[PDB]
Design a protein around this ligand. Structure first.
Ligand code: SAH
Ligand code: SAH
Ligand code: M74
Ligand code: M74
Ligand code: HF2
Ligand code: HF2
Ligand code: CA
Ligand code: CA
Ligand code: CA
Ligand code: CA
Ligand code: FE
Lengths: 338, 333
């Protein structure tokens, strides 16, 4: 029961499940993106031809997708219908982690044997699908970081007037703050013009054109940023799912110091990220963990543990006054700093 | 059923994705063979010898460990309870991930009818070739050689369709000295590979290669050598002759292009029918699903049994294959 030694028939079944999990795993992401996981969540079942027709999909491949999900118990096939399976709720809950792993990071993991050799580790030595990462990170943010984020907003003690968001992405965080604090002004800062664009768009659509603005920027050197005339007035800083990019340490320490000086009227800084775990046994790794850590190690990108964050704030010029543990995203955390 | 049980199963599915990809890697990088011989290895020592980035190598092995293929004990890796089974099928994992990963990854863009024109999917052909060499050897060789052992004649000229690396023709030359060999492959890369391998081993006089599409074998020129062939072989590509009406015509063209062929050995994997979803063996789902995504017909065994006579051939022997979905070698004449 998880740590054993086995029959030939058992080893056969297990290896086959590894193989099929691979296709299932890729199908969870795709089934989310194509609208099937929603239809099933709402209705508990669906008709595959009907689905393939309504969405104008090559139907043999659609059968293949459901059969892959059925092979490991996420769904159950019955004649022409697919019904939710025993593992539906949990796989649907984590679907964006599957999307992230496959649709987003698949190239990296597939090219494992070209990535690992030193001779190869320079220049553009791996490729991520940026638009798929985005798509997934949008739901990861909402689904995993929202409770703690909102709790931290609730503990602010004050009402912000001007909020800065580092790595703003979709701009959805700034928009929901806008909804929460009528008459606040918001300022996103991403490194990706693609994200800038989608945000300006997503904002205009919601009618927060006057409230919210963005800017191409590298938050690790916030000082060398055209637009730092609006920073002085900001009283709330946020930074979610990008913080590990401040690292390695002395760069994080400097970035934190630069951030302290650049935003001297910031009262609260809210910083959320996933972190590198320690000492979890191989056969008990939960969803996400392995992918996040291994991927970062393949890319050569540093990932701090939680103690590495805790031990850096003072030197960086900030005090941690509240900490929230995140549910179900490896070991992830929100810090409330001042 | 049980929230604890569902969490575990879903985490195993997620980690399985990373282990699957790592099997193919462990194989290609030399780790599986080192664990096969010694039953253990040292990650630091391993990483040093092969000039690998050590943290990525740790992760590679942790992925394997997460699903019981290996066990980690400090900086040292031991064979796990599922090591023999997975090492045995390693080439199928390589095919699925290193070879075909980009197809499955792009399922949301591949399924929509609207995108299904032109070059709508990509495979890594070099990766595929690499896996197919072992798949050929490991799953097909025994039936291949039982068919050779039982031909009822010694061949003088053999042609191999989809000759690939040329390895089949080389082994036939080793068994049958002074047999003449001829490989047909549609890919310039396979031809050049095979040509190098053949000349390198000293088989330059005996075996040649010609680029061509076996589906239209009637248009391939080989300076009248096809008339001389008395044994024909075709492994792991036959499903490409389908759909049905296409296959009939292709089989009739092979019959005309090779009029002195006595036996035609045809080995392939086939589409299965009625396997319950939770009991699907290794390979099956990936073969079937990937061809349905690529828009390529995959026949069942019965479909094949039923096309041969219309195709101008008579099936005289049939060998069931071990442990590659439902695979087969037909001997036709
Ligand atoms: N050094 C840097 N400076 C600014 N943005 C960065 C960055 N490193 C990464 N990013 C951005 O950080 C984002 C990661 S996704 C985070 C999305 C957002 N915080 C949310 O919770 O919804 C991407 O938009 C990426 O371009
Ligand atoms: N229509 C066709 N005509 C000729 N060769 C083909 C083909 N379709 C695929 N192939 C070739 O068939 C090979 C499939 S891999 C098969 C390898 C070989 N028969 C063996 O047993 O090892 C590839 O080299 C590919 O280029
Ligand atoms: O390391 C990253 O930045 C990406 O992997 C991705 O944007 C992400 C960040 C944080 C949590 C989850 C995903
Ligand atoms: O279908 C193909 O041609 C490939 O998927 C692969 O070469 C293969 C064929 C037959 C059996 C096993 C693998
Ligand atoms: O030192 C720590 O563990 C956290 O970074 C922050 C913290 C410290 C004290 C009280 C609350 C939070
Ligand atoms: O019908 C079949 O089984 C196969 O096509 C081949 C076969 C038939 C009869 C005797 C031997 C082989
Ligand atoms: Ca089931
Ligand atoms: Ca050792
Ligand atoms: Ca031709
Ligand atoms: Ca089995
Ligand atoms: Fe094929």
């Amino acid at each position: 029961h998880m740590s054993t030694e086995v029959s030939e028939a058992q080893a056969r079944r297990a290896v086959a499940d590894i193989f099929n999990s691979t296709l299932a795993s890729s199908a969870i992401g795709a089934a989310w993106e194509l609208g099937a996981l929603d239809e099933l969540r709402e209705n508990g079942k669906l008709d595959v031809s009907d689905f393939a027709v309504r969405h104008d999909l090559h139907e043999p491949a659609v059968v293949g997708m459901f059969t892959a999900l059925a092979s490991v118990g996420i769904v159950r096939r019955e004649g022409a219908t697919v019904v939710v399976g025993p593992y539906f709720d949990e796989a649907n809950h984590h679907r964006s982690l599957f999307h992230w792993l496959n649709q987003g990071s698949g190239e990296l993991f597939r090219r494992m044997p070209q990535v690992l050799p030193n001779e190869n580790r320079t220049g553009k030595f791996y490729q991520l699908d940026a638009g798929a990462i985005s798509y997934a990170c949008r739901e990861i943010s909402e689904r995993y970081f929202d409770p703690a984020f909102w709790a931290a907003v609730d503990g602010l003690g004050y009402t912000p007037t001007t909020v800065a968001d580092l790595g703003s992405g979709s701009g959805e965080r700034l928009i929901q703050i806008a909804r929460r604090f009528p008459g606040v002004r918001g300022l996103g800062v991403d490194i990706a013009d693609g994200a800038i664009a989608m945000a300006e768009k997503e904002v205009a659509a919601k009618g927060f054109g006057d409230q919210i603005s963005f800017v191409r920027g590298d938050a690790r050197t916030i000082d060398q940023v055209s637009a730092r005339g609006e920073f002085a007035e900001v009283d709330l800083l946020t930074c979610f799912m990008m913080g590990h990019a401040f690292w390695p340490r002395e760069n994080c320490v400097q970035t934190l110091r630069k951030l302290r000086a650049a935003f001297p009227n910031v009262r609260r800084f809210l910083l959320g990220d996933a972190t590198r775990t320690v000492g979890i046994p191989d056969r008990e790794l939960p969803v996400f963990t392995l992918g996040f850590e291994f991927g970062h190690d393949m890319m050569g990108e540093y990932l701090p543990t939680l103690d590495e964050w805790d031990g850096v704030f003072e030197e960086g010029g900030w005090r941690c006054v509240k900490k929230h543990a995140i549910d179900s995203l490896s070991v992830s955390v929100v810090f409330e700093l001042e």
